[PDB]
Amino acid sequence: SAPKPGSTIPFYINKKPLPTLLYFGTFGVIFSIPFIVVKYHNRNL
Amino acid sequence: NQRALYYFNEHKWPIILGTWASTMGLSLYAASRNRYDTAPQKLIQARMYAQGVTVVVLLGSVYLSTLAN
Amino acid sequence: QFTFGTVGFDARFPNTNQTKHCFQSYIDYFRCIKAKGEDFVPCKQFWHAYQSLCPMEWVERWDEQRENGTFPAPI
Amino acid sequence: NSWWTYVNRWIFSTNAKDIAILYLLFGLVSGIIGSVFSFIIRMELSAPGSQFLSGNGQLYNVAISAHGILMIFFFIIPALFGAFGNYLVPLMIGAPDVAYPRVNNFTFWLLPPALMLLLISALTEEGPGGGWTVYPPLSSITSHSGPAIDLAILSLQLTGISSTLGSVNLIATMINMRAPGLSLYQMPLFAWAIMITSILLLLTLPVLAGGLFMLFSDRNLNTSFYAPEGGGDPVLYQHLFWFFGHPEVYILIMPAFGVVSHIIPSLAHKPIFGKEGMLWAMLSIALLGLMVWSHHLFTVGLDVDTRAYFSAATMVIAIPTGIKIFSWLATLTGGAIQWSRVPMLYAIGFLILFTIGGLTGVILSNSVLDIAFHDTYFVVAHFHYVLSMGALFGLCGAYYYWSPKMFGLMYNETLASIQFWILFIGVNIVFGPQHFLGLNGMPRRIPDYPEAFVGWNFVSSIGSVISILSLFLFMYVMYDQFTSNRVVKTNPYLIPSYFDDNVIFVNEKLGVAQSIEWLLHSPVHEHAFNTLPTKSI
Amino acid sequence: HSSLSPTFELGAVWPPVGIADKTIDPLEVPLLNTVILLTSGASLTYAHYSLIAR
Amino acid sequence: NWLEEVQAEEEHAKRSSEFWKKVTYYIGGPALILASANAYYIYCKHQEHAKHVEDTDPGYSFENLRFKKYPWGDGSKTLFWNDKVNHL
Amino acid sequence: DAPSSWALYFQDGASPSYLGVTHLNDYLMFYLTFIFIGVIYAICKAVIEYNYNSHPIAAKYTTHGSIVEFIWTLIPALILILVALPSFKLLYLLDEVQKPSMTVKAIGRQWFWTYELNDFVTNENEPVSFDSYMVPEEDLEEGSLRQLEVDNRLVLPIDTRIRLILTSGDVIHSWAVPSLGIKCDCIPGRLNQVSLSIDREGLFYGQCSELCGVLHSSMPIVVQGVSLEDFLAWLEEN
Amino acid sequence: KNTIVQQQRFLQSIHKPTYLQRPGSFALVYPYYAVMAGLGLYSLYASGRVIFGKKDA
């Protein structure tokens, strides 16, 4: 096997219309985790 | 001499470290002169010599330590 | 009424760490009172040597441990 | 069915190239969480008094401890020390793959469970409260009751042993897989640095393993290892911890040294001044950065002679680093400079910040001087202005410099430069006022402060906000680069000299580079170096 | 570190008071175990050399 | 060629193997048996037991620390707990 | 003595070691400002003028240090010796012990500070001890300083030198006061011996630094100097 | 008795990965994978019980 890389190693397919919402939602939830973390310690208070 | 032995058994740790270093150096000098003897094998033989000398000097020291008059 | 007198410049240990001094003064005072007598003057100054610098709060637990005899000292 | 191919190419794959990308991604997902933690803690101290919270001091302790631990052990070490080494070291040594592929595959996957268990531990009823440097009595079952800090201890243990296991194969790879005719002396500076960090980390971390395990056993087996009534001395714990902590920052920052020494010449088109002197001074730094450990115990109350012995030697560290900075300054002058390039921008901005941070570090290396700054905001300013200005800048420069080799795409120069400027300004106005806050004589790790400190905290908060926009812009530029299909040539950083014809250069000059990695196509082959490159013996 | 500088509740001796007489004597079963280990190493070296001798 | 060198190496290895067999069956055995006899003498000398002592400054305040319950059993037993050498 | 707003210097204080520390800091800052501005100007000038559009030719054939590396080794090392020496004689002055007069004890368990003056034990058999506590925000006196006052304030006479005793019986604390420049670690089990000497008669402020749990920021320390007659009246008051 | 050469030649004829080259290896991994999946499913509930302060009774 002698394949030529297409200069594309993104771990997941990317394109304009649809995947943008998925990427932005993942970014938002991984940004906002600390929020639920800080809310958990002050739940029963 | 009744005084040399007092210092010989007073400080067992420093003299034992010195004789261990002497044995290590002498064994390294003697062993590292042959052809059919690689460096790890000669080091192992030197360390075995050191272990034997350490055991015998340990038995000698624990034998002479009873003289605590 | 009052004078400025306490533990002097301890020549045994001049460094910052002087934790062993309290225990040394305690055991030395106990050895001193065990021998000699009781009303003798000199070790009354040794009595001050483990109260001025010691917290005196560990002294209560020291008394509790020593009263039952479990105190681990030669004297 | 590409699903089997998908998971064989990603999960059941041991190629070095397919792993460093995951290293970068894991570093990124740790760094975002850490940056948000830092933002929340800095927003807490915007104004005096309980703010956005019900005065929860334990929550603030959890936040600071989590930020510190996750950003020191999940952001910079795994995404810089081995991320840019496992991918690149085989390229510069002349080998097709690392010595032990299976251990290389194994080391990466010990980290995700560590992150999950650390998050679970922080999600307990109390959470870790000892800070980045947890201390035995505070960690004692007396204060914390639950599985909060034990899991943090376990995470530190397993991350350390994984990093040690992730550095055993590298040394063998760069000591035995050398190219024919490539003497160890003639090795490039970057791999020299990375090997020095590997050997230092492997030599030191076992001590942490043993000390951390024996300290943790106090909570379960009720050992008297560090109990004040049990005969244990916590100063022993401090000595054990700071026999590791002091060289850790150096082994973290040496890859930044190597990446700067690599970025400067290629974008300056001038060979590095005094390679042998620089590498020997760096070796002197590596050997020197072990016998000095008690500068973190200046106000504990040790003896005079020990304090003098371990404070006098703190100064001698500066001399080789100053020599390195002077050598880089000499290299910059004379040769051509393309100051508009983003890697050049980061390399230039690294030097001034690193040297001012080093000056701050040499400020407080004296027992006579540390008493006025020990455990105050001044040490916070020093160590932050060194860490986040050197290691973060080196990581950003390395990413922006070797990204086409990792993937084969081009980023947006305008947005990257804007991000660099915004981040530089924000981080300069974040740690600036803290110098004055610590110079006034006000301690660190305090959610509340006396009223006469509000102004500098207010000045720091705006920069803390600005850093978040910098992060957002970096995320946008990364996404754009990933989905812009902008092609890249073999050696994008090679340009014709002043006397190269436009037809002679294109046909009789291509395929030449100062380093091996630029000789191959930007998306590198799975099996490179079919035959060993042979130099002049 | 735990031995060279004992705490001041230890009686100024690294061997604990009352437990010092309960320590391990130098001449007992562990010494026999050490000599067994030394002879085991000698036998293993003999086996390795004989294996070298095919 | 290979024959002479392999013969010399095998001869040296065989001589060393014979010497090591003499070592392991000449001096190691006597030392082992002497140590075993001395150990048996020491073990048999002290067969008086009397390993139940109390009221002579008991506890010493740093014995059997219980801050977290021991996982095995009720919580007051260790893995190698003994009814004759372990007391309270 | 107390923090101000928009402060740039450290503060105005009164302690024999504090003045020497400030002097050493001034000398060291004078040393480092030189190098900082020099390196900044070098970095700026080596790039602002040598951009590619103005310097298309690079003198790539100079990669040897003939006499420059030696001066690099010497001159900053000379500066290093010049800064090390004054700090060394300052430290070798401080490590000595003056003539002892009296001692104080600063044992503190958790979120409060206890002080003892057991030097004056006499027939009265009433050693003086108390506990300094965080004053609540609501009960602050009109015009008081938030987060920097205590109810049972410590009292030490002026111009008298005290060999302070530092001890703790809980998680490690610290005993800090920037005006006096004296600090040490409240390490449990072991006692730390520190000295002190006040020149003026004024109120001094400070607090701990080493974190000791949730309320690490709730034990301010206030020590104020008093004259001999005021000191005697205070002592006979209790 | 020395069957290592015969079995070597027998086993070199297949193109399977080295972790499945020897016949009968597949039967020791599929139930192993099922047991690992069950362990993960149980540990999910275990961790969820640990974080949420409570104990079954």
Ligand code: HEA
């Ligand atoms: C990130 C990497 C890093 C680097 C490179 C350094 C560099 C140095 N650090 Fe720092 N340091 C940390 C990370 C780092 N440090 C961290 C994380 C902590 C806190 C630990 C914690 O609490 O967890 C810390 C804390 C710390 C302390 C503890 C203070 C306290 O808390 O009480 C001390 C004290 O000695 C110290 C010293 C030094 C010194 C002497 C250097 C020297 O290497 C600096 C040398 C550099 C220069 C000086 C500039 C270049 C030189 C020249 C231009 C030559 C000419 C100069 C002169 C003659 C003036 N560091």
Ligand code: HEA
């Ligand atoms: C790895 C080192 C590191 C880094 C990078 C940081 C980053 C930051 N730290 Fe932290 N910090 C520590 C190490 C670090 N810190 C340590 C050891 C402690 C002590 C813990 C203890 O006390 O227990 C500490 C504690 C600490 C405190 C103590 C709280 C208190 O005492 O009151 C504060 C508060 O100001 C703070 C602030 C910050 C800020 C604002 C940033 C940053 O926001 C500054 C700007 C940086 C960024 C905003 C991130 C940029 C990232 C990118 C652009 C993404 C790149 C991604 C890739 C391509 C993979 N840090």
Ligand SMILES: CCCCCCCCCCCCCCCC(=O)OC[C@H](COP(=O)(O)OCCN)OC(=O)CCCCCCCCCCCCCCC
């Ligand atoms: C940090 C201190 C802890 C102790 C250090 C040991 C760490 C665990 C052991 C890892 C092996 C070390 C290298 C051996 C040499 C080598 O390389 O073995 C070779 C292989 C890799 O090389 P290769 O086959 O590709 O070579 C090519 C051959 N020509 O190794 C392995 O497959 C390791 C086996 C997997 C084990 C990983 C799981 C580790 C469990 C850790 C928990 C147990 C310890 C807990 C401690 C509290």
Ligand SMILES: CCCCCCCCCCCCCCCC(=O)OC[C@H](COP(=O)(O)OCCN)OC(=O)CCCCCCCCCCCCCCC
């Ligand atoms: C703390 C600060 C204190 C500073 C004290 C240091 C004073 C001495 C330093 C000056 C020595 C170097 C001068 C060159 C003399 C010479 O003429 O050298 C000879 C060579 C000439 O080229 P050639 O070798 O090819 O000649 C071939 C003969 N046939 O020059 C050079 O190549 C210069 C190239 C490297 C020098 C760049 C300097 C960059 C900054 C240096 C440090 C800046 C300090 C900033 C803070 C003040």
Ligand SMILES: CCCCCCCCCCCCCCCC(=O)OC[C@H](COP(=O)(O)OCCN)OC(=O)CCCCCCCCCCCCCCC
């Ligand atoms: C996974 C790795 C775990 C083992 C690591 C080994 C490391 C060696 C150095 C550490 C010292 C160990 C000594 C204790 C041995 C012992 O048995 O302790 C002694 C006690 C009982 O003895 P006794 O009082 O009766 O003795 C007096 C005789 N009359 O038994 C125990 O407490 C059992 C538990 C000890 C731990 C060993 C088994 C580990 C299982 C849990 C794994 C924990 C993982 C932690 C997080 C990774």
Ligand code: CUA
């Ligand atoms: Cu008291 Cu920190």
Ligand SMILES: [Ca+2]
């Ligand atoms: Ca606040």
Ligand SMILES: [Mg+2]
């Ligand atoms: Mg401290």
